[PDB]
């Protein structure tokens, strides 16, 4: 959904 998820 144009979604993005990142670990920081």
What does this structure look like?
By secondary structure, the chain is low in regular secondary structure. It has no helix or strand. The radius of gyration is 7 Å and the shape is rod-shaped. This is Cysteine-rich PDZ-binding protein. It is found in: Cytoplasm; Synapse; Cell projection, Dendritic spine. As a component of the minor spliceosome, involved in the splicing of U12-type introns in pre-mRNAs. Involved in the cytoskeletal anchoring of DLG4 in excitatory synapses.
What descriptive keywords fit this protein?
8 residues; little secondary structure; 0% strand; rod-shaped; Cysteine-rich PDZ-binding protein
In short:
By secondary structure, this protein is low in regular secondary structure. The chain is rod-shaped, with a radius of gyration of 7 Å. The N and C termini lie far apart (21 Å).
For the secondary structure, the number of strands is 0
Rg of Cα set: 7 Å
- Helix fraction bin: under 10%
* CA distance, first residue to last residue: 21 Å
Describe the sheet with the most strands.
none
- Overall shape: it is rod-shaped
Q: Count of helical segments?
A: 0
**Helices and strands: which structural class?**
little secondary structure
PDB class: peptide binding protein
Keywords: PDZ, glgf, DHR, adhesion, synapse, synaptic density, peptide-binding domain, peptide binding protein
Entry title: The third PDZ domain from the synaptic protein PSD-95 (G330T, H372A double mutant) in complex with a mutant C-terminal peptide derived from CRIPT (T-2F)
Name: Cysteine-rich PDZ-binding protein
